From Swiss-Prot, chains B, C:
Protein name: Inositol 1,4,5-trisphosphate-gated calcium channel ITPR1
Processing and modification events after translation: Polyubiquitinated. Polyubiquitination targets ITPR1 for proteasomal degradation. Approximately 40% of the ITPR1-associated ubiquitin is monoubiquitin, and polyubiquitins are both 'Lys-48'- and 'Lys-63'-linked.
Function: Inositol 1,4,5-trisphosphate-gated calcium channel that, upon inositol 1,4,5-trisphosphate binding, mediates calcium release from the endoplasmic reticulum (ER). Undergoes conformational changes upon ligand binding, suggesting structural flexibility that allows the channel to switch from a closed state, capable of interacting with its ligands such as 1,4,5-trisphosphate and calcium, to an open state, capable of transferring calcium ions across the ER membrane. Cytoplasmic calcium released from the ER triggers apoptosis by the activation of CAMK2 complex.
Domain writeup: The ITPR1 structure has a large solenoid CY assembly built around the central helical bundle made of the C-terminal domains from four ITPR1 subunits. The solenoid scaffold includes domains responsible for binding of ligands and regulatory proteins and is connected via an allosteric nexus at the cytosolic-membrane interface to the transmembrane channel assembly. Six transmembrane helices from each subunit form the central ion-conduction pore.
Subcellular location: Endoplasmic reticulum membrane; Cytoplasmic vesicle, Secretory vesicle membrane; Cytoplasm, Perinuclear region
Span within the parent record: 2701 to 2750 of 2750
Span list, region Disordered: 23-50
Family: Belongs to the InsP3 receptor family.
């Protein structure tokens, strides 16, 4: 039923055969890019599908910015004249805008079966291309395959049909397909039984001789994709709630309950803490999605995160079977139905920005709010209050400030970086590191360095940061979770059991040298150096940190410065614281 | 053009009704008805108471 | 001409539905338902188983 | 063997075309098939033996499925003139078989 086009439709992959599975890689990270053998039902995908879901896109640019990119480095003792430098920057960025042109043509383009067609990954805005060419990941015909926006030589697709049904020179909409090759040859491809310890089954696909089924279904359209709408395949933050508040769940006292902190520091539409937790809803019924259901949608507001989205029943009193906690989703349970005011009538076309009444259907009512619990001591905030189980109608408004993909994507940059560094925090705490772990961690760490300013590259120390420091809220989402850890890595790398020292062992390991690692803590110091500036909330989390400064111174110285620064402014506181 | 198009509008109210009734069909078999429951049945009525 | 004809398209979706339901009627009385058966009736529902 | 008549493996085609509300003339391009009372779906492969050969080993199908899948249907259209040539053919063969009997 239905389904007709491509490009501007946007969907995952499902190599599903042997080994069966959805196709993805968590985090940027930058990661051992992969797929998931654990997978989930065709009908019942694993929650990671939010990462799994790829974005189709016509081959584009795919040329001279390789030149700009490969002109970036090689030399002896050699470089190139600055006129080539800046003018070929014009080559670069104007080529960017070229890509902007053909992607203005993007939504217009209809794929035919057998077209070389190119793919991307929205959840990271990246795509695979390596290798052949680039160095292998070990296997029979060993070869890596990753992701990037390089859009370079290898991606590019394999001319794309096969089987028997359906010869080249026609339209394939939904089925299963032969996907990418490198230009460097580049197909066939892996199915693999090859992964490592950080994850369970975690294979991938490239290069080597092996037939495989693929493709996806109903996900995004030329209609829905622009813009705002209800981005069903990529919904953002949970909140009905207009009581000057945008409630969304959090764990508390080892309990998962929808909540919000007091006042919200006033305002609403203003950016705040990401206590959210968001996303996922359209069906006929089936796993197929895409968000195109318009107001007569009947479709979930589950959180990131993860867990339910429950609230329902009848309304001091007990309220068992009500507000959200933990998965599983599935089934039918607090599914919710929106009630736009728009101008009320026969409307059946794309909810946006303006928000009105909500009502779960089996309960037929209606998510209220207010009416205050206690949480024992605080008081400040006192306020877990809702996750409503109403009975009748009323006042308050729903849904979501649309949030640009790039910064929830920044959360993917975030909490992921935090976890993947929590693991290596578990490595070097034992003192072990590969030099590869070293280069990797400093790689993503430098990724913090240019996560500062938009200036991605290259060898630029800290003064450039000084202007970027006032700029970008960054520091707050940084604080949202990650800050717990970097400094911790400042701690235990010297600390337990005996990796230091004191000053002696830290420097002798420092005097013998790779290069970043002495500066790595300094660089973590450098990024907190990005962080302390401006708002006070980035300051108090320097409390323990200045002891860490004494420580720082120890050685040387540085630291111282821061303180102063613171102182210057613061002073006061410172003063207060320281003282003693 | 205007009488023609207004009667076309009448077929547009016809459109919204003939779609609402069976979108009503979807929402109901799914969850009326719803839861838881028981039945059966129816019853008665119831009514109431007083 | 374009709004007129697009609403005409809406009556074309109306066409395909109003035909599919009773071609569905044919396939069903014939073989649902278916054978053988027984018845009666119704029942219850159924549912489944586990 | 016959008889046909009745209702028995009547089959229903499932064109992909571009799937939706299509109701107009199948042609050349071929997709899914499904008998209705069984509601499934003519598979294939999965190999019998026929005792000795082996070459060919292959009576394999005439399928009695249960669920969906992959392979495509229907017919290369064939010009009337040469099936007509079969009318020229097997008929000539029979009518000459008779005079062969004469």
């Amino acid at each position: 039923m239905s389904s007709f086009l491509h490009i501007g439709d946007i969907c995952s992959l499902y190599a599903e055969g042997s080994t069966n599975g959805f196709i993805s890689t968590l985090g940027l990270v930058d990661d051992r890019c992969v797929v998931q053998p654990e997978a989930g039902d065709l009908n019942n995908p694993p929650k990671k599908f939010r990462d799994c879901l790829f974005k189709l896109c016509p081959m584009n640019r795919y040329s001279a910015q390789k030149q700009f990119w490969k002109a970036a480095k090689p030399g002896a003792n050699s470089t190139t004249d600055a006129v080539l430098l800046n003018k070929l920057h014009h080559a670069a960025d104007l080529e960017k805008k070229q890509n902007e042109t053909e992607n203005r043509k993007l939504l217009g383009t209809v794929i035919q079966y057998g077209n070389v067609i190119q793919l991307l990954h929205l959840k990271s805005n990246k795509y695979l291309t390596v290798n052949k060419r680039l160095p292998a990941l070990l296997e029979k015909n060993a070869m890596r395959v990753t992701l990037d926006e390089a859009g370079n030589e290898g991606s590019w697709f394999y001319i794309q049909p096969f089987y028997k049904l359906r010869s080249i020179g026609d339209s394939v909409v939904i089925g299963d397909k032969v996907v990418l090759n490198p230009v460097n040859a580049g197909q066939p491809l892996h199915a693999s039984s090859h992964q490592l310890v950080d994850n369970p089954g975690c294979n991938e696909v490239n290069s080597v001789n092996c037939n495989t089924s693929w493709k996806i279904v109903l996900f995004m359209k030329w209609s829905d994709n622009k813009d705002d709408i209800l981005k069903g395949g990529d919904v953002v933050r949970l909140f009905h709630a207009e009581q000057e508040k945008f409630l969304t769940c959090d764990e508390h006292r080892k309990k998962q309950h929808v909540f919000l902190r007091t006042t919200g520091r006033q305002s609403a539409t203003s950016a705040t803490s990401s206590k959210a937790l968001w996303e996922v809803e359209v069906v006929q019924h089936d796993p197929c999605r895409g968000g195109a259901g318009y107001w007569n949608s009947l479709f979930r507001f589950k959180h990131l995160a993860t867990g339910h989205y429950l609230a329902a029943e009848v309304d001091q009193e007990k309220m068992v079977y009500s507000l959200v906690s933990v998965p599983e989703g599935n089934d039918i349970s607090s599914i919710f139905e929106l009630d736009p005011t728009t101008l009320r009538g026969g409307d059946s076309l794309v909810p946006r920005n303006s928000y009105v009444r909500l009502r779960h259907l089996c309960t037929n009512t209606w998510v209220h709010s207010t009416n205050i619990p206690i949480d024992k001591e605080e008081e400040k905030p006192v306020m877990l209050k809702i996750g409503t189980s109403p009975l009748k109608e009323d006042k308050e408004a729903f849904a979501i400030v649309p949030v640009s993909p790039a910064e929830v994507r920044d959360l993917d940059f975030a909490n992921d970086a935090s976890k993947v560094l929590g693991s290596i925090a578990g490595k070097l705490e034992k003192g072990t590191i590969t030099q590869n772990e070293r280069r990797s961690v400093t790689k993503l760490l430098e990724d913090l360095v240019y996560f500062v300013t938009g200036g991605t590259n290259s060898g630029q120390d800290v003064l450039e940061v000084v202007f970027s420091k006032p700029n970008r809220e960054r520091q707050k989402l940084m604080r949202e979770q990650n800050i717990l850890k970097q400094i911790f890595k400042l701690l235990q790398a010297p600390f337990t059991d005996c990796g230091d020292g004191p000053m002696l062992r830290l420097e002798e390991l420092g005097d013998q040298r790779h290069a970043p690692f002495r500066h790595i803590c300094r660089l973590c110091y450098r990024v907190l150096r990005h962080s302390q500036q401006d708002y006070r909330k980035n300051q108090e989390y320097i409390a323990k940190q200045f002891g860490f400064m004494q420580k720082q111174i120890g050685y040387d110285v540085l630291a111282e410065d821061t303180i102063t620064a613171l102182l210057h402014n613061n002073r006061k506181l410172l003063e207060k614281h320281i003282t003693a | 053009k205007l009488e023609s198009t207004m009667k076309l509008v009448t077929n547009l109210s016809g459109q919204l009704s003939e779609l609402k009734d069976q979108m009503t069909e979807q929402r109901k078999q799914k969850q009326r008805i719803g839861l838881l429951g028981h039945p059966p049945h129816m019853n008665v009525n119831p009514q109431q108471p007083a």
